[PDB]
């Protein structure tokens, strides 16, 4: 019981906070998008084309 | 606001548990509430006359500068300048 | 058995002291005082009971 791991199937995809909020942001740098716009899109405040 | 009946007694208005819970929490869990030091009578009297700058609404040991720990000219006759702990609480706990 | 030796040690018979005197002979121990600022804070000594 100290070695066996489980898993949870997510109904919808979720972003990893380490690759988002740890400066410099990896997702923002890869997408060349501002971090604020990514945060707004992720937490359901605006749309993205 | 929700009630209907006009035959309502004042005992139906008051639930005494929250006040007792708050008083018990203060008297049994506050940082300034602590067991009496019973080594000797002088220890008890010193404990009963202790003045602390910590606690709720007070300073923090890690976030205290040199100015607040130093002896002030206004301390003359009000706070003993030589009775204080020798550790990191050096300037934050005083005696009357 | 191990249990008999445990009982003998707990009762502290006279032969246990001689056995201990033989055990501690030429068996160094390390003495340490905190804080350890340099390597001279740990040194080995020959115990004397």
């Amino acid at each position: 019981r100290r070695e066996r791991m489980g898993h949870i199937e997510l109904a919808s995809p979720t972003a990893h906070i380490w690759f988002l909020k740890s400066l410099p942001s990896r997702i923002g740098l890869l997408l060349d998008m501002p971090l604020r716009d990514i945060e707004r899109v992720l937490y359901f405040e605006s749309y993205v084309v | 606001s929700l009630g209907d009946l006009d035959t309502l007694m004042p005992q139906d208005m008051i639930n005494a548990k929250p006040i007792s819970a708050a008083v018990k929490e203060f008297f049994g869990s506050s940082q300034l509430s602590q067991f009496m030091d019973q080594n000797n009578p002088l220890s008890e009297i010193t404990h009963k006359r202790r003045i602390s700058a910590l606690g709720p609404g007070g300073l923090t040991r890690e976030r205290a500068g040199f100015e607040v720990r130093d002896v002030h000219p206004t301390h003359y006759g009000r706070v003993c300048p030589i009775e204080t702990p020798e550790g990191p609480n050096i300037g934050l706990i005083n005696s009357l | 058995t191990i249990k008999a030796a445990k009982k003998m040690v707990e009762r502290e018979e006279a032969v246990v002291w001689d056995i201990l005197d033989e055990v501690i002979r030429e068996h160094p121990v390390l003495l340490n005082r905190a804080p350890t600022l340099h390597r001279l804070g740990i040194q080995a000594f020959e115990p004397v009971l």
Partner: protein
């Protein structure tokens, strides 16, 4: 219903911004929903009553659970009432759905108030929501107060005391004799293994002194694990009586004890 929801506060504004319908046009949507299965009718009915759930959940803020979780639990209950609404009765949906919304919130509080479920059986659930109001003074009930509570609610005295303990329990965080693993002392296990091994060897040595017939009697009935030979089975194999097998073990065991004790 395309308003943005960046947090719970932004979600409440959209719910309140919806206009509250009147009874006249509420019937038309409910009638279409019941007979023609209009998904749009259910969509309008549910959205127009979102503010109804929000102010109900505010009354359940004493349990320490997040407000957002309570609101969503009520939303599921609201949908159940909408699916089972009969417009011909003439009553408003607000009065009909109040029983469904509060039933979903109650079940969520029971399962999430503590790390372990406090009330599972029928009697425990009744005492969960009644002991909060019945209790007036801090401390434990005396003997007399137990029957008074038990008599009204139709429960036993055991249930009242059991739920009383469950209400005041405060759970500590893991960080005192509870951090210690109780099966970690290997030194004791080594000593016990040594003691049991030297006692077994004495049994083997003692069994060698027994006669050949007596050894098979002790070995078959007592040492075998796959089978446990009874008295009668050993009787036919050696042509002896049923009592003779039983009487032989007593003398053999005395010899076994004598060798072991010496």
């Amino acid at each position: 219903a395309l308003a943005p929801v960046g947090n719970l506060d932004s979600y409440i504004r959209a719910a309140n911004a919806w206009p509250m319908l009147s009874a006249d046009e509420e019937r038309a949507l409910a009638e279409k929903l019941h007979y023609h299965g209009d998904l749009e009718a259910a969509k309008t009915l549910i959205l127009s009553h979102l503010r109804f759930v929000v102010h109900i959940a505010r009354n359940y803020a004493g349990y320490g659970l997040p407000q957002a979780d309570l609101i969503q639990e009520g939303n599921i209950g609201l949908m159940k009432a909408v699916r089972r609404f009969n417009p011909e009765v003439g009553v408003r949906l607000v009065s009909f759905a109040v029983h469904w919304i509060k039933a979903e919130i109650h079940e969520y509080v029971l399962r999430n108030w503590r790390i372990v479920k406090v009330a599972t059986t029928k009697a425990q659930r009744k005492l969960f929501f009644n002991l909060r109001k019945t209790k007036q003074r801090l401390g434990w009930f005396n003997q007399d107060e137990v029957e008074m509570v038990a008599r009204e609610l139709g429960v036993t005295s055991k249930d009242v005391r059991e739920m009383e303990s469950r209400m005041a329990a405060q759970d500590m965080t893991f960080d005192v004799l509870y951090l210690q693993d109780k099966s970690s002392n290997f030194a004791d296990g080594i000593e016990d293994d040594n003691w049991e091994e030297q006692a077994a060897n004495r049994l083997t040595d003692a069994m060698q002194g027994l006669d050949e017939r007596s050894q098979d009697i002790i070995r078959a009935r007592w040492l075998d694990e796959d089978n446990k030979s009874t008295l009668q089975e050993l009787a036919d194999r050696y042509g002896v009586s049923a009592e003779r097998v039983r009487q032989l073990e007593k003398n053999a065991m005395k010899k076994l004890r004598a060798a072991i004790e010496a």
